[PDB]
Amino acid sequence: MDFLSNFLTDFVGQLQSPTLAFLIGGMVIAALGTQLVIPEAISTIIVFMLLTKIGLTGGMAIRNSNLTEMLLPVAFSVILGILIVFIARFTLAKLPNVRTVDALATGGLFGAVSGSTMAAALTTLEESKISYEAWAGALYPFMDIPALVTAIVVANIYLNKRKRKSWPIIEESLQGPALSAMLLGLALGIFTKPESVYEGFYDPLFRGLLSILMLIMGMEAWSRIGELRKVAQWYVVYSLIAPIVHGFIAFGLGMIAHYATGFSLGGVVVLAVIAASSSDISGPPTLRAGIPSANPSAYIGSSTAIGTPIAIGVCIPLFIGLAQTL
Amino acid sequence: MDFLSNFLTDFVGQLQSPTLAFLIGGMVIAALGTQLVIPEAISTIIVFMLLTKIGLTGGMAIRNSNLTEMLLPVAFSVILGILIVFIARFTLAKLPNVRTVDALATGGLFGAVSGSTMAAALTTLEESKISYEAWAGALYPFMDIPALVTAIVVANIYLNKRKRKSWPIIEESLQGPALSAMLLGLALGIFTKPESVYEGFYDPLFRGLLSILMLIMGMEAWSRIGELRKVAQWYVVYSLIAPIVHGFIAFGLGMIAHYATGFSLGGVVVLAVIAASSSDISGPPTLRAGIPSANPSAYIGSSTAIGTPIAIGVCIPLFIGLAQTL
Amino acid sequence: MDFLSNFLTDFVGQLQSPTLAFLIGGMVIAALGTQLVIPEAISTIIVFMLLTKIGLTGGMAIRNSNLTEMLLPVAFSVILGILIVFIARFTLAKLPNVRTVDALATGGLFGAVSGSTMAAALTTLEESKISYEAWAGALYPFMDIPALVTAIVVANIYLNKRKRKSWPIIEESLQGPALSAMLLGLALGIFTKPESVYEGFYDPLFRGLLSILMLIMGMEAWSRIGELRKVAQWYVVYSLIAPIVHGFIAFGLGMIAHYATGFSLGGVVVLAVIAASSSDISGPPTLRAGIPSANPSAYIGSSTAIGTPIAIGVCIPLFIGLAQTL
């Protein structure tokens, strides 16, 4: 039981961690020139082979675990996935002039991430004291598959009832790169035994390859946050606040499992930081071929530029301190 | 001494191994769409740097071993390499209408592989009980270099004595990518001491990079097995049977070294699965620039689609059970 | 205390080491054809992510070390960096017809390397007996940053006072690829704590990725040493001698820190082989956009073809024997 004095010394040392240090280490070079560029072939084998580590981890956790205890955490994740896009359909919409709903339901892409909460939460979760379950990454496909289709279906059915009337929807999204690269991980995690290729090639160079992909995402965010000044003054305010308010409606909704079906308080924090995350890798390859009328800076510049630096900044050392309070 | 009841429980658990699980895990996504694609630059640094692990392994095994015991296994491998293409020149040729000999001697490309028998046999050989020698991968350059030139020389001299007359042959094949990438491994394995770069970069990420290359080979095999319906009904029958019959003429011919030398009975099985393999990586970069009039689906669709799934399916758990019978 | 008899048995076994063995293993295949080629996307993610290991190593060595003992080795490195280009402005210039000074001050690019002296000296330094300090790679940014700008500024101010008059200079060089990839390593080595991504992804596959990059550099050196016959007969003589004479003016100038500072005698040798090195990776991306009138074979063919094979050939086993004499 320790105050906000313990918070500030965590935030300095968690900004100093090697995942976010390259992100703000890529912004600071892009403000200085830097003709450095990683080619497009490397940045599409880092998008694969880093969404296969998450599929294999979630797939291996379903074999060696009972399917009794993993009902309440996944029914509080599907419901927690669908709820986020409807809140943003009521929160961010009823606003001044930037209320282009198809560029606003996609701004509620806030599903789950790879860059944090699988390598940021889990490496500071068991760094200090507290332990968690085996199915950390098994809550990644849930709240990512349902949280993106409801962005598509809502923003597609809203367009037909206004401009035209003045399975094939989910099929083009799920059949695509960086989302069939994850379902290949689950089917080979549930059915087969890849314990010699996961631990040895996909698992040791996972934390390292994330730092290359948070260098691309850092220095392609310097111009895109400057181009965001053209769009609005309200996507900034939604970006600083909604990664906070999506945690507390998940932290209390995750506080039902504790007083019902296990789900250790050390696991609730690995459910509440997942829901405040703003997808980066599974996100923009979808929601662009699914929703073409997109304005592709409102939902990317609010997730990779302001979204995840606050999602690793002021809410993972927050909910560790909330977990240490109990 | 245990019956076919022990065979079926091996085949289920050997189809569940992480090498063939991605192959039939790449077919099953390609039947479902999957805009996923690994770019051409990555799939030509996986072809190199996986034929350098085999060159370094065969090259290191020749230094720390006597050149007395490695004469009968390599004279029963060169002879076993040249014999396969002549059998197919007599077996598959005297047939109905698909007997285009230049698309048939290349269908006898059945040399040695990387994808199995170096990572499929050797990881199930010493998985259970039985031990083998040090020169497992030193039988890879033999029965691969002579088994491809005799595909070229026979199908080139047959064309000149029929259409035109109605060293420079082997030089264009051996001087090419994915075959000079292997001789670079041998010359740096015999002469130099790369024990700090092999074990540390080429050896730990060998089993992992094979699973990316058996994902390309899996989802480029869905259309190519459907295009094979245009060609014939006889390249299928040669594909299901010749990886069985090339083993027993190698298992008994390897049974002359166990009763005269000592490459041991656990080594004979790592000679008989090598000869029933249907090359995948050294194969099609050769036999295309060497033999242009090729019809490049008859010899690739019979080796990477039907050839190697039977070569890991029903003949590596077979000859382990034959070895456990003795 | 042991004679030149111990030298020859080192040179045979140090030519047999896996760094230079691929270099002369890439020349010997390029004299034989070899359609093998590593694509341009791979050879620009090996140039990055191998100049980030050197930035992180130098950056981590400045945190956990006092800034008292690292003044005399870096003031004997900046001065040793600027002196080399002025010697070559007086040695190589006053010559017959090939004295094109802008193709001659760049021929004095002899700063520091990655391919040797970080993986060639340091892996034979602590191989036998002798120990060195912690800041081996922290002498890489020094004598590389000042040694290239003085190649640019001298050869730019010489052109203006002869053809035209018959910060923005260093800015275009330092703001570029393969040199901002190193300053990203230092700023993330001094300020942050990347001890979980360095040791695990950048450090284990450093020695291996150097052998791919000394395979490109080996087989792109066969034609370029033949094209060097067109240029001169004097860039050869400067290439065989100046990696020897730059060591002894550094070995005695490093012998002032052994009798006035803590810089040990085992560290002097890791200062004197650094100054006889002829840059390969940070070199030619600079000095080409900085100095366009370059004749880009005089300064590359003298550094990657004759420069570094003598810089690993006859001067790292030399100065180990000089260090073992004392």
Author numbering:
A (entry chain C), B (entry chain B), C (entry chain A): 1 to 166, 212 to 371
Show passages lifted from the paper:
SbtA, which is ubiquitous in cyanobacteria, is an inducible high-affinity sodium-dependent HCO3– symporter within the TC.2.A.83 family of Na+/solute symporters. The sbtB gene from the sbtA–sbtB operon encodes a PII-like signaling protein that senses the intracellular level of the secondary messenger cAMP that correlates with high Ci conditions, versus AMP at low Ci conditions, thus functioning as a Ci sensor in cyanobacteria. The tightly packed trimeric structure of SbtA is exclusively stabilized by the gate domains at the center, with a threefold axis perpendicular to the membrane plane. In summary, this study provides structural insights into the cyanobacterial high-affinity HCO3– transporter SbtA, which exhibits a new architecture of Na+/solute symporters and its fine interaction pattern with a PII-like protein SbtB.
Here we purified Synechocystis sp. PCC 6803 SbtA and solved its cryo-EM structure at 3.50 Å resolution. Notably, the TM4 and TM9 helices in the core domain are unfolded and form a crossover at the middle. In the gate domain, TM1 and TM6 are divided into two helical moieties, forming a kink at the middle. Structural analysis showed that SbtA of a 5 + 5 fold is topologically similar to Neisseria meningitides ASBT8. The trefoil-like helical bundle of the gate domains possesses a completely buried interface area of ~3000 Å2, mainly via hydrophobic interactions. Structural analysis revealed that the substrate-binding sites of free SbtA are inaccessible to the solvent from either intracellular or extracellular side. Thus, the structure of free SbtA represents an occluded conformation. Substrate binding most likely promotes SbtA to adopt an occluded conformation, as seen in our free SbtA structure with a Na+ bound in the pocket.
